Ligand SMILES: O=C(c1ccccc1)[C@H](Cc1ccc(C(F)(F)P(=O)(O)O)c(Br)c1)c1ccccc1
């Protein structure tokens with residue numbers, strides 16, 4: 078019962094920011110205040126073709142390393158949210174030459190789920206679209222088979238089998254693909270986004286029994302940042318005595334310690350607030 082007033086305060090605050098048209102100002106404060114750490118490995122000449130965008134790089138301190146002697150580099154970051162007790166890997170959409178690296182990362186990190194928030198057409202077609210046309214990544218010795226998929230209006234869930242060809246171990250990977258979230262846009266609705274997030278949660282993919290979920294979009298910052306921020310803030314609102322004590326700006330700044338550029342537009346920041354308030358009300362209702 079105590080939560081009613083807390084949610085009223087959150088909704089009032091949201092409405093005050095809307096009325097004043099202050100989302101961009103708050104978003105620019107976040108950009109201004111965001112961490113700046115070196116990305117020396119990302120910038121090595123040998124890695125140029127491993128980055129989709131020159132201007133989007135993983136920090137050295139939080140990058141995911143491939144277990145390779147040859148070249149350990151992938152444009153991917155580990156976001157470790159200590160208070161929420163959740164970790165995520167945020168990565169760019171695989172390139173034609175980094176699909177093997179992507180799946181190697183999924184394997185090595187022991188991930189159970191991949192969350193994709195963009196569409197191919199960018200991003201390489203890194204998973205099989207037909208059961209009978211499996212993919213083999215010869216560079217990393219991995220085989221990937223589409224087992225089934227469930228296509229809904231705003232998202233698709235695929236069951237994939239990932240096989241390490243060296244050991245013959247197989248793992249089930251769940252692919253959660255939100256298909257209606259344009260570059261620098263927002264999801265179809267808070268409801269659509271939350272339904273999707275709740276499906277990811279329900280699947281167990283986010284549990285500490287597994288490696289970190291792999292989340293990507295095109296650059297691995299805007300949509301991926303929005304998704305992870307909302308999830309973390311929802312965790313915190315459930316965990317804390319007072320849900321209104323969760324400061325979404327503060328949480329985003331924390332996440333930006335681990336990867337640059339998380340949340341790419343003022344409207345995405347707005348959306349994150351809206352989705353978190355609505356999701357928390359739902360959960361705590
Ligand atoms: O490379 C980019 C850039 C470079 C200098 C200044 C500003 C931006 C971004 C890289 C970038 C950064 C973020 C996203 C994103 F936000 F949409 P995401 O949700 O992370 O895929 C995308 Br798509 C792309 C860009 C933006 C528009 C067109 C092409 C490239």
Ligand SMILES: [Mg+2]
Pocket residue numbers: 132133338
């Ligand atoms: Mg930039």
Ligand SMILES: [Mg+2]
Pocket residue numbers: 207208
């Ligand atoms: Mg068929």
Ligand SMILES: [Mg+2]
Pocket residue numbers: none
């Ligand atoms: Mg088999």
